[PDB]
Amino acid sequence: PLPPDITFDSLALIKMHSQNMKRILEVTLAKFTVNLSIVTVYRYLTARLKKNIEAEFEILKDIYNIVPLLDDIAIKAAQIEANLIKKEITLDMEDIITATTAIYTNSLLVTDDPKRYEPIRRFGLDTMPLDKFIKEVELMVEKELI
């Protein structure tokens, strides 16, 4: 079964807000606590040129638990990335902070590209492909109603 706390990276969050995902997003918000790193929120607001920024942020802050780049997160992220650099791995800032925040909040990281975060698994990170997450949420709903 899916845990209570989950999170998404920017790309997955963008998909969760697509028009054909409206019902699944509604169910997800009703059943889980979504803990988004402020960096994910930032990337969501930029990659997404269409609407209004400050207004969009208020909406996100109202439906999601936005997690700051807390001191403890900055420290752990530096430790994790330093360990990866030695192993010759290329993760950008957004990915490192997103994964570290997920570990800190004990949230399952839902993403379309779990493989990219694989090197962080040994540090306590748990991931799940977005497609599988969606199917599990669908199954949850079906069980509730049938």
Add this chain to the structure above:
Amino acid sequence: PLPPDITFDSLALIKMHSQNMKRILEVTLAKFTVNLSIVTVYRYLTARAYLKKNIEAEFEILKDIYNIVPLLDDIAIKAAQIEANLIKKEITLDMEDIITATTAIYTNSLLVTDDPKRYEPIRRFGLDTMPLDKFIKEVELMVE
């Protein structure tokens, strides 16, 4: 001269903590308020962690001498506002640069960097920068 509030980006910070900059550092810490973005601190500590330093202890020191600025909601908002305005005109900078510059604007801090040119597109939003070499020269005068 130099304003009351200043900040450094990652490379400038490294240099400010280097051995032959010890004198300049503490004259800076005594005369100005340095507002460092937590993003800059993260980059700095990543290098220190690679060198197997006790970054928890070093962070405590940074906290005691610098005003560490969180990636505040308002900073995230202003940064997104800036990046999308820049993207409108084929201009793109990495996240660290946008947040660092936005934080300097937010705290009314002069951004001291060894590469002022890459921040040029953000000056239109109110950012003021000063090359590191020039900052060092001015502090040296104060050192007397």
